[PDB]
Amino acid sequence: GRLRVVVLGSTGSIGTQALQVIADNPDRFEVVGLAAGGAHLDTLLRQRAQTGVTNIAVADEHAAQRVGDIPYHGSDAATRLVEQTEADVVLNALVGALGLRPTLAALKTGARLALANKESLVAGGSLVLRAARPGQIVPVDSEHSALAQCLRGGTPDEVAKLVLTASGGPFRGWSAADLEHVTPEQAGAHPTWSMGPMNTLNSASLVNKGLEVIETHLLFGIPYDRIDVVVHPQSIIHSMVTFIDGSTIAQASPPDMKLPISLALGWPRRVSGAAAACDFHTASSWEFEPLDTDVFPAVELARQAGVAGGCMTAVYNAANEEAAAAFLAGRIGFPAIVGIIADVLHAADQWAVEPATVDDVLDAQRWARERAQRAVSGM
Amino acid sequence: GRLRVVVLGSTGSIGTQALQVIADNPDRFEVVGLAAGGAHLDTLLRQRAQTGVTNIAVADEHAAQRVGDIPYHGSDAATRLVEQTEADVVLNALVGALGLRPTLAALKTGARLALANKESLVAGGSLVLRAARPGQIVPVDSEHSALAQCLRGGTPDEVAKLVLTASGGPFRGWSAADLEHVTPEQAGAHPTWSMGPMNTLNSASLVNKGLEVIETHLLFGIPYDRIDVVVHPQSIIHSMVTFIDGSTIAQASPPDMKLPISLALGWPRRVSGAAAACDFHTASSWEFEPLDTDVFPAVELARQAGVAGGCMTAVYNAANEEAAAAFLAGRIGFPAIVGIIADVLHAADQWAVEPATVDDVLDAQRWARERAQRAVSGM
Ligand SMILES: NC(=O)C1=CN([C@@H]2O[C@H](COP(=O)(O)OP(=O)(O)OC[C@H]3O[C@@H](n4cnc5c(N)ncnc54)[C@H](OP(=O)(O)O)[C@@H]3O)[C@@H](O)[C@H]2O)C=CC1
Ligand SMILES: NC(=O)C1=CN([C@@H]2O[C@H](COP(=O)(O)OP(=O)(O)OC[C@H]3O[C@@H](n4cnc5c(N)ncnc54)[C@H](OP(=O)(O)O)[C@@H]3O)[C@@H](O)[C@H]2O)C=CC1
Ligand SMILES: CC(=O)N(O)CC[C@@H](c1ccc(Cl)c(Cl)c1)P(=O)(O)O
Ligand SMILES: CC(=O)N(O)CC[C@@H](c1ccc(Cl)c(Cl)c1)P(=O)(O)O
Ligand SMILES: [Mn+2]
Ligand SMILES: [Mn+2]
DSSP: OOEEEEEETTTSHHHHHHHHHHHTOTTTEEEEEEEEOSSOHHHHHHHHHHHOOOOEEESOHHHHHHHOOOSEESTTHHHHHHHHSOOSEEEEOOOSGGGHHHHHHHHHHTOEEEEOOHHHHHHHTHHHHHHSOTTOEEEOSHHHHHHHHHHTTOOGGGEEEEEEEEOOOTTTTOOHHHHTTOOTTTTSOOSSOOOOHHHHHHHHHTHHHHHHHHHHHHHHOOOGGGEEEEEOTTOOEEEEEEETTSOEEEEEOSSOTHHHHHHHHHTTSOOTTSSOOOOTTSOEEEEOBOOOTTTOTHHHHHHHHHHHOTTHHHHHHHHHHHHHHHHHTTSSOSHHHHHHHHHHHHHGGGGOSOOSSHHHHHHHHHHHHHHHHHHHTTO | OOEEEEEETTTSHHHHHHHHHHHTOTTTEEEEEEEEOSTTHHHHHHHHHHHOOOOEEESOHHHHHTTSOOSEESTTHHHHHHHHOOOSEEEEOOOSGGGHHHHHHHHHHTOEEEEOOHHHHHTSHHHHHHHSOTTOEEEOSHHHHHHHHHGGGSOGGGEEEEEEEEOOOTTTTOOTTGGGGOOTTTTTOOOOSSSOHHHHHHHHHTHHHHHHHHHHHHHHOOOGGGEEEEEOTTOOEEEEEEETTSOEEEEEOOSOTHHHHHHHHHTTSOOTTSSOOOOOSSOOEEEEBOOOTTTOTHHHHHHHHHHHOTTHHHHHHHHHHHHHHHHHTTSSOTTHHHHHHHHHHHTOGGGGSOOOSHHHHHHHHHHHHHHHHHHHHTO
16 A cells, blocks of 8 residues: 655755654555755754665765765765655655756656655756656645645636735735845744745745746646736635636645645545644634735746746746845845846846757756856846 | 526526526527416516527416416426426526425436525435435535535545535624614515515524535535534635645635526536636635624534434424514514524424425424424413
8 A cells, every 4th residue: 555755855844744744644655765965964864763764865975974874975866866766756855956857857767746846847847747747746835736626626628717825925015125124034034834945035035936836837737827826924725726607716724734745645645634624713814915016026027937938937946046045145135036037037038948858957047047146246 | 518407486586597697608508498486477478588488387376377378387387397398407496395396306307406495405305315316416505516616625535524604694793692682674684676584584593504504414415513614704705625634625706696506507517707706906805703602503403403314404494484484573582583493493303204205394394383383472
């Protein structure tokens, strides 16, 4: 019975929650592979001693060294683990477009792919899709896990709009003016639950949502002018679908990535007690309000990148990563993140071409990153 | 494919909206028979003129006398028309227990039953289930249509509970006291041109939700203690399905029965443009609050009555019918409606038996009214 799972980026936020669900359901899953950057050795050590898995991948050469006994090391350590470890599912919980190679390697083994690393799909684009077979990529991201469950009840020609909900980030309601005084402390702190750093910042910049709009077009095949976004502070409703008759179906639950993770891992069977359900034993209200595009153009920028397509989406992400890094380092301002992105994108003309090989994509991201530094150093 | 529809109760609210839907979607539907009571004979004859259907039935002979060329007339006219008409869908929009025979005749023809009539299920419980085959009955009630669509979110064995939403009525969140000086007009007991003061009252009394809770059990097989009710003022979400993993699927839409009516008619294919969808260009809110059962025991009784099965639900509804009348005639106070219902059910233990024939159900009701009328006059 048990499904054989490989966890990439097991030491991270998604990763550890994934091993909890696997630990709490030994009847459904078995851990057969682990991979990490190398920055959280003690975590990785305790993960090995607990799951009893030694088939491990560590990116950092020096780190893999002082730990000893690690079969795969170096930047390709994660991709090699995938190619040589038989599994049923590969949970890609790595962060960044760097996870693009493990994703392709995973699809190529034929195993299912629990995707969390959205950047590999955004950057991969059509390249990754050709690699995947119908329904091989199961979403872990909560908006997509939701859309999936909501679409279970219908056919595409009956779908009118896909409505993605966004928390609005912690600066929701502010003006372009106020935004300029934002500091790395305010865009990486969260009052009620936690995620990784990069994903936390993108949440504040609304670029994460932009990233999810593209992930949606790619995963579900719905055109960009039929994928909506709406701010929902509570983040209880995780996404909705509107059908041609006027009916809307939506997925809801108290925030907890454990939910979409256990579903992705157990696809197509739900996992009992994976998470807590909405409690109507006590009053509450679910609010909705439109996103302010003038103050947060991030999502419009994503759509534009998407419509143009090709490696244009990889540029979008490559640019963001460089500016977000420049931002947290204290080299540029917050409004500058989206700003630097429109700049890089306005010049990405030669990249509207679909990628023929990973290389075409590495080339586009390469270009984007530099053009992004040039724009940063331009300030 | 063009489905052939038989509309029972064509001059009513559900029936005229069904005809609007059919009129605006000829490519999908076609009317091949209409049935009314005779209270609005002129409207029925005009419908004959408009649609071109001569295959009509009127219950009232007196009324039928005023026309002379009606194929089916007299008690059982509607049942005869069903048995005599070839069709793909019979829409039962009849009111009261007299809608029970037509529902049964319909199921026997094997046609799809878009069931609106509440007594068919609430009164003829086991008689209707044993008679219908799986998936033959598609609900027209907004709450049930919602649950039908949300259940596509998982298998029957993954459903942890069904959550029906109620508007709460006019005395929503009121205190047990407040309900003392409650008068008829307050409970919206107005003489509207179309539907009687009962709905508005059952809705203000939560007895409607109770009946809906009973119909839910019989339609989806979910044990009563796993059927919750929650107050939702806006009435946008119509019901939700919570699964064993914590995910909850909800169905939202602006209030318009044409939506659930167009579902039942062409299930499972959605009808383009049936109703208007939820627009999120506008900042709205969906509020939820629990129901104080100690102030509205209405729903708790429905569950007790339905757990007892047999004709006990018929008792529940008949007992309410009279009690409601007593309140509408000042004979009793508001809190007294559910209280009297409480009494009548506590003494109907004999009606726990499964009804064998339609007469078994009518008797239970004839009985419950008597007993309820007694508790009013205090005899
Ligand atoms: N956290 C959340 O709530 C959500 C996350 N996601 C997505 O899931 C993905 C991961 O999110 P998250 O867990 O929060 O990010 P984290 O920062 O918490 O973890 C990132 C993981 O990747 C590993 N890693 C970093 N670099 C490399 C490398 N070069 N080679 C191999 N492994 C590496 C890290 O190992 P190390 O121990 O050395 O750091 C770490 O385990 C992201 O793409 C994100 O967008 C999506 C929706 C929700
Ligand atoms: N209205 C709503 O929003 C909802 C209604 N429902 C249920 O759907 C059912 C019908 O609702 P609704 O349309 O509003 O009720 P209506 O009073 O508006 O219409 C009842 C219809 O049945 C006809 N009728 C009455 N008696 C007979 C008879 N003996 N033989 C043949 N036809 C007869 C009437 O004709 P005539 O008037 O000429 O006598 C009329 O066309 C009910 O059981 C109700 O509870 C469920 C959910 C929502
Ligand atoms: C959990 C998840 O899926 N995310 O994308 C984290 C970021 C998003 C977010 C932030 C906070 C919460 Cl509680 C939730 Cl459910 C989602 P956002 O809507 O701000 O972009
Ligand atoms: C012809 C005209 O102007 N009318 O207002 C007809 C209204 C008629 C009417 C009244 C109420 C209903 Cl619900 C229906 Cl279907 C039809 P009536 O039964 O009163 O004749
Ligand atoms: Mn997300
Ligand atoms: Mn209803």
